[PDB]
Amino acid sequence: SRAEDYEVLYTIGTGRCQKIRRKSDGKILVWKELDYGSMTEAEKQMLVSEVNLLRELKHPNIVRYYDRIIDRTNTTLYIVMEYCEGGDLASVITKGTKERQYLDEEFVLRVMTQLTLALKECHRLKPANVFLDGKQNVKLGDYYMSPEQMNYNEKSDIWSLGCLLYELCALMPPFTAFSQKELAGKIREGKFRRIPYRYSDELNEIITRMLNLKDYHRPSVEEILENPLILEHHHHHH
Numbered sequence: 001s002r003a004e005d006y007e008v009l010y011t012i013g014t015g016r017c018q019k020i021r022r023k024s025d026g027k028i029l030v031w032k033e034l035d036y037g038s039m040t041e042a043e044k045q046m047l048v049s050e051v052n053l054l055r056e057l058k059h060p061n062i063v064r065y066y067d068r069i070i071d072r073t074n075t076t077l078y079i080v081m082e083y084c085e086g087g088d089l090a091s092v093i094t095k096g097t098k099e100r101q102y103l104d105e106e107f108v109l110r111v112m113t114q115l116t117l118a119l120k121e122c123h124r125l126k127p128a129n130v131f132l133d134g135k136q137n138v139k140l141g142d143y144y145m146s147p148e149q150m151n152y153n154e155k156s157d158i159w160s161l162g163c164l165l166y167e168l169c170a171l172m173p174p175f176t177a178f179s180q181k182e183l184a185g186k187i188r189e190g191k192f193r194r195i196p197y198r199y200s201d202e203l204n205e206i207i208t209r210m211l212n213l214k215d216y217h218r219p220s221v222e223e224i225l226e227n228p229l230i231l232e233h234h235h236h237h238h
């Protein structure tokens with residue numbers, strides 16, 4: 001439970017990750033260095049509540065949180081968590097664009113199913129906040145603004161997931177604009193292209209239903225799962 005117990009392999013993204021290996025067993029994890037040196041007792045309570053909340057969630061489709069470490073000599077809190085060895089989804093989109101190949105509908109279904117399960121757990125979000133493990137399994141972790149969020153309910157997450165899945169299919173968000181007001185206009189207009197014709201009408205139908213303007217028209221977390229399109233192997237397999 002100390003920064004001296006871990007070795008640093010390299011930095012992933014500057015808080016700043018590092019990817020760490022624990023000398024005891026040799027386990028690969030990551031930590032994020034958040035330096036509170038410039039924070040008063042005000043930030044302490046909120047940050048500790050955030051830590052309490054994050055270290056409590058135990059779900060396969062969410063990046064697991066493990067330990068907390070303090071090195072007062074550095075005033076940098078290390079937050080430890082699992083290392084999704086497959087990277088984030090934004091990198092998958094980047095690789096798809098750079099090789100002129102579309103992602104397999106089965107993979108889009110995987111992401112849809114596992115992220116819907118993760119959202120259901122959170123009730124009981126960009127391609128960069130979504131990682132993959134070695135089994136190509138989807139983990140959630142810390143353009144997509146919803147109609148209501150810009151005139152905040154559970155269906156707003158449905159909308160965000162619909163935008164994510166659309167971007168996975170089409171390799172670009174459903175609403176492309178240069179200015180923010182132009183984006184809000186394209187959204188309130190509530191119109192977008194169909195996902196590539198390589199994808200079934202059913203995938204497009206579920207994704208479109210997520211992107212309805214009226215929140216009460218988007219599918220609940222369960223209506224998404226009740227869909228004949230979602231099979232077993234789209235689920236997280238250890």
Ligand SMILES: */C=C/c1nc(Nc2ccc(CC(N)=O)cc2)nc2[nH]cnc12
Pocket residue numbers: 012013017018030063081082083084085086087088091131141
């Ligand atoms: C701290 C970031 C982080 N990284 C991983 N694995 C991984 C992520 C991204 C990439 C490509 C990139 N961003 O350059 C490769 C590997 N897993 C994590 N889990 C929690 N935080 C991370």
